[PDB]
Design a protein around this ligand. Structure first.
Ligand code: AZA
Ligand code: AZA
Ligand code: AZA
Ligand code: AZA
Lengths: 306, 306, 306, 306
C-alpha cells in the first residue's frame, strides 16, 4: 500500500564546504570543480515503513518522527557533511537517517541545487572574481535523487539513484527546421525551414556504478555544469530537424563523453516564438513574439545500447 | 524504453455543454449537478508508440503528428463532445485519436477543470443568479486522468483511469492536536494539544468500474464537489490527532459513501501557522503568522480493504 | 529627496475579532457584515523622516527602528485592536507608531485582506455552516491604504486614505461588443458585435470624510463585498461597448449607492479569449482558448462631478 | 482626471539589431557594449488625452486606437528601429505614436529587457562563445521608462525619463554588521556584528541631459551591466553597517563614475537567512536557512549634491 510522509522545501545553506576538485575537463566544458564558498540545497525528504500504519489508522504518534525533526536532521547533517557533492550529501543523510530510526524501511531524497554565480569586485585597484559576494541565480540548477531501503537482513541498499540538470532554457536563432510532418484535417502548422528553436531542458542521468555519483573519486563524477555545456554545444553544431532529433544527439554525446553512465533521460518543452516580420530592409534580422500558452513537450531516454 | 511526446497547457473553453444532472446525493453534500453554461478544461496530451523511434534517431517527421495538431484535435473535439464530464471528454478524445492515428500505440491524457463561480445581478426587480456573468476561481479544481492503449489485436483498452480534486486549502482554527511524537536530539517541536491545523489537500479516486467515471449513468458518477464536501465535513467533526489521522478518516468516509469506488489516494501538505500571541484579555482569540517555507507532507492510499 | 524604509509581507491572522455589523445595505448586495471568526491581513509599512538621514549617509543606526521590530509592532497591535475593519486597524497602527517614535515624521500603511470562505459540516443531524473550518481563497480580496503625517505642531493628520477591492476576475459569455474603433495600417483586430469579455478588475475608492472608513459608525462604511456585487450586477445588466464604457458604468453606480464616497478609481485588464469554433450543430454553444500574453488595460477615475 | 489605457506584456524579440559599441568603460566593469545578435524587450504602453473621454462616458470608439493595434505598432517599430538601446527604442515609439495619432496628448512607456546569456560551443577546434545559441536568463534585467507630452504649441517633450536595472539578488557571506539600533519593548532582533547580508536590488538613474540616454553618442551612455558591476564591487569593498548604509555608498560610486547622471534611486529588500549552526569543528563554515516571509525594504535617492 502507498504510505509515506516527510518534509519538503528544506532550504539549507552552507559556507565553506570541502571544494570539489579533480574533475577532468572535456572539450565542450571548462568545468574542473566547484569552490563551494557558498553551497545551497533545497531538500525534499520522504520516508516509508509498515510500522507507520497506526499513525494513520489510530492517531498513534509513538513511532512518528516529526517532519519538523526531519528538517532539523537534514540541516545538522549539512553542517557535519565532509563530502563534496549533493549526491554524496543525500547518501550521508539517508544512511544516517536509517541507522538512527530502525522502524523506517525506506527513505527517498531529492536535492535541488540553489545556484550562486560569481561577481566582479575591485581589490586595491584591480577587477577580479569576488570571494565574498555572490549573485543568486534563478536559471538552471543541478539536481539529485536517492532512494535507500532497509532489507529484511538489516543491511542498507541504494535501490535508485539519478542525478540531473533542471531549468535550462536555450534558444538557437537559426539553423533549425521542422518539416515533413503529417498534413491532414487537423494540421494548420506551416512547415518552417528556418526557425528560432526555443527549448526548455530537464536532463537526468543514471550511473552504471552508484559509487561514481558521490564524488569520492572525482575522475568518475559527471557534473551538471558539464552536461549543460554539452547541450549548448550540440544545439549549436546541429542542423536540428526537430526537438526529438536534438535530444537524441545531445544524449548520444553525453554517453560518449561519459562511458560511466548507463542512461540519459530527457524532458523537453517547445516554447518557440511566433514570427511577425520576415524581412527587414538591409539587415538579416527579424521580429518575433510570444506564442499562445500551449507548449510542445518530449520525453526520451538514451541508453549505451544505442 | 521511455519515448513520449505531446502538448501541454491546452486551454479550451466550451459554452453550453450538456448539463450534468441525475446524480446520486449524499449527506455531506447538497451537490445536485452542473449547469455547464461555461465549461473550462486544461488538457495535457502525451502519445507514444514504437513506430515513433525514427523521429528521434533520424529526424524523420513522416509519422509525426505535430504537437500543434494535437491542440487542434482537442479543441475541435470539445466542440463536438456530447457528454457531461471531463472524464468522459478524455475518453472521447483518446478513442477518437487512436482511431485516426493507426501508428500510435498509447495515449495519456490529463484534464484539469478551470472552475468558475456563479455571480448575482439585479434585473427585473430582484437579485438572482446570472446566466451570463461568471467569476474565475483560482481555488480548488477537479481533475481527470486516462491512459488508453492499442492492443495487439487492434482493440482499444483503458489501462488506467483516475479522477481527482486538487488545490483544496482548509484551515481548522481549533480542535486539533499533535502530541506523543518521538522526543530526541533532533526534536525542537513542542507538543500541542490545540493547534490551528492548515492543510493543502489533493485527493484522487479510482473506480471499480471504469464506465462509472464517464457520467453516461450519472448515478454512479462521483463528483469532486461531493468529495470536497466530505473533506470539510470530516475535518470539522474530527478531533484530529495528526494530518495522517485526518486523511485516513476522510478516505474512509469517501469509501463508505461511494461503494462503486475501489480506492482513494491523498497528497496532503501542512502549512500550519506559528503562534505570536496566546492570550488576548476579554477574548478567546489569538494572533498567528506565516511559518518558514519547509512544509510537512503525507501520502496515503485508503482501499476497500478497510 | 526620497527616503523611506519599512517591512512588507507582514502576515497576521487573528481569531475572534469584534464582528462587523450594523452595515447599511444596497440593492445589488445582500452583504450584512463579517463574523470575523477568522481575520487575515497582509501588511506593508513604510516610514520616513529627515532624522533618518545619517542612518544612510554615516551608517548610524541610533534612530533606526529595526524593520523586524515593525513586524512585531503590527503583530502585537492586531492582538490589542478593538475595531472591526482593516482601514481602522491601519489608523490604530499608524497613530500608535507615531506616538511611540517621535522622530518619525511620516508613516504609510497598506493592508491586504487574506480571504477565507465558509465551509459546511454534517453534525447533530443537519448540514450547517462550520464555525471552525475555513477555506483559504486565492480569489478577490479587500484592500486598505493610509498615509499619516506628524505635523510641525506635534499633532497627527491623515493625508491620504484609500480603500479597495483587488483580484476580481469576471467573464461575461455574451452581450458585449467592440466596434467602431480606428482601422488603419496598424489594425488587424476584427470588429466584434458579440464577444466573451473577460476582465480583471482592481477597484479603489476614497471617502469625503476619512472617519467613515474606520467602521466606528458602521452604517457609513463601504464594504468591498458590496463593491464586488455592484460590479457583477452592472456587468450583467450592461450591453457593453468596451471595457472603458463598462468601468464608467460601474463607477457611476458606486457613487450613486454610496454618496459618502468622493471618487472611485479603476485599474482594469482585458484577458478576453480567442474564438476557435463559431458553429456547434444543434446548440448555441462555442469553443474558445487562451490568447497571447499581451493584455489591454484601462485606468479611470469617476468623481461626484459626473 | 486620471484617464489612461494601453497594452502590457508586449513581448518583442528582434535579431541582429545594430550593435551597441564604443561605450566608455569603468574600472568596476569590462562592459564595452552589446553584440545584439538577439534583443528582447517587454513593453508596456499607456496613452492619455482629453478626447478619449467619450470612449468611457458614452461608449463611442471613434477616437479609440485599439490596444491590439498598439501591440502591432510597437512590434512593427522594433523591426524598423535603427538605434541601439531600449531607451532609444522607447523614444522612437513614443515620438512616432504622437505624430501618427494627433488626438493623443500623452504617452508613457515602460521597456523591460529580456536578457539572454552566451553559451559554450565547440568552434574551429576549441570551445568558444556561440553566435547562434543563447540561454534565457531569469536573473537581473535592464529597464527604461519614458513619458512624453504634446504641448499646446504642438511640440513633443519628454517630461520624465528614467533608466534602470531590476532583479539583482546579491548575497555577501561575511563583512556585514547590523548594530546600535533602537532597543525597546518591540525589539527581539539580536545585534549581529557578522551576518550574511542578502539584498534584492532595483536601481534607477536619471540623466542631466535626456539625449544621453539614447546611445546615439555611446560615450555618454550608462549601461545597466556597468551599474550591476558597481553594485557588486561596492558591496564587496564595504564593511556594511546596514543596507541603508550600503545603498548610499553604491549610489555615490555611481554618481562619481558617471558625472552625466543627475540622480540614482534605490529600492532594496532584505532577504537575509536565519543562522542554524554557528560553529562547525575544523572549519570556518556555517549553516543557514530561509527566514519567515516578512522582508525589510529601503527606498532612497542619491543626488549629485551628496
Ligand atoms: O500532523 C502532523 N504530522 C506530522 O507528521 C508532523 N510533524 N510535525 N508536525 C506534524 N503534524
Ligand atoms: O520539434 C518539434 N517537434 C514536434 O513534434 C512539433 N510539433 N509542432 N512543432 C514541433 N516541433
Ligand atoms: O474594450 C476594449 N477596449 C479597448 O480599448 C480595446 N482594444 N482592443 N480591444 C479592446 N476592448
Ligand atoms: O540593514 C538593515 N536595515 C534595517 O533597517 C534592518 N532591520 N532589521 N535588519 C535590518 N538590516
Amino acid at each position: 500500500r502507498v504510505m509515506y510522509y516527510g518534509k519538503g522545501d528544506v532550504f539549507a545553506y552552507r559556507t565553506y564546504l570541502k571544494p570539489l576538485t579533480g574533475v577532468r575537463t572535456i572539450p565542450e566544458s571548462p568545468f574542473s570543480g566547484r569552490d563551494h564558498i557558498l553551497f545551497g540545497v533545497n531538500v525534499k525528504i520522504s520516508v516509508g515503513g509498515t510500522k507507520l500504519l497506526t499513525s494513520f489508522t489510530k492517531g498513534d504518534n509513538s513511532l512518528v518522527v516529526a517532519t519538523d525533526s526531519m528538517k532539523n536532521f537534514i540541516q545538522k547533517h549539512l553542517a557535519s557533511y565532509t563530502g563534496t557533492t549533493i549526491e554524496g550529501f543525500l547518501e550521508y543523510v539517508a544512511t544516517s537517517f536509517l541507522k538512527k530510526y530502525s522502524h523506517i524501511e525506506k527513505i527517498s531524497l531529492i536535492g535541488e541545487e540553489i545556484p550562486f554565480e560569481t561577481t566582479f569586485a575591485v581589490k586595491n585597484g584591480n577587477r577580479a572574481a569576488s570571494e565574498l559576494v555572490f549573485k543568486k541565480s534563478r536559471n538552471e540548477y543541478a539536481t539529485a535523487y536517492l532512494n535507500m531501503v532497509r532489507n529484511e537482513d538489516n543491511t542498507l541498499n541504494i535501490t535508485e539513484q539519478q542525478s540531473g540538470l533542471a531549468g535550462l532554457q536555450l534558444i538557437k536563432v537559426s539553423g533549425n527546421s521542422f518539416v515533413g510532418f503529417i498534413r491532414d484535417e487537423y494540421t494548420t502548422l506551416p512547415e518552417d525551414s528556418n526557425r528560432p528553436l526555443f527549448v526548455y531542458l530537464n536532463i537526468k542521468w543514471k550511473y552504471k556504478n552508484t559509487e561514481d555519483s558521490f564524488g569520492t573519486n572525482p575522475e568518475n563524477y559527471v557534473a551538471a555544469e558539464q552536461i549543460r555545456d554539452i547541450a549548448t554545444s550540440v544545439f549549436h553544431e546541429t542542423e536540428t530537424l526537430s526537438i526529438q532529433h536534438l535530444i537524441y544527439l545531445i544524449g548520444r554525446r553525453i554517453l560518449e563523453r561519459f562511458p560511466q553512465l548507463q542512461e540519459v533521460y530527457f524532458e523537453s518543452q517547445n516554447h518557440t516564438w511566433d514570427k511577425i516580420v520576415e524581412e527587414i530592409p538591409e539587415s538579416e534580422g527579424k521580429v518575433y513574439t510570444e506564442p499562445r500558452p500551449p507548449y510542445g513537450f518530449q520525453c526520451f531516454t538514451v541508453t549505451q545500447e544505442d
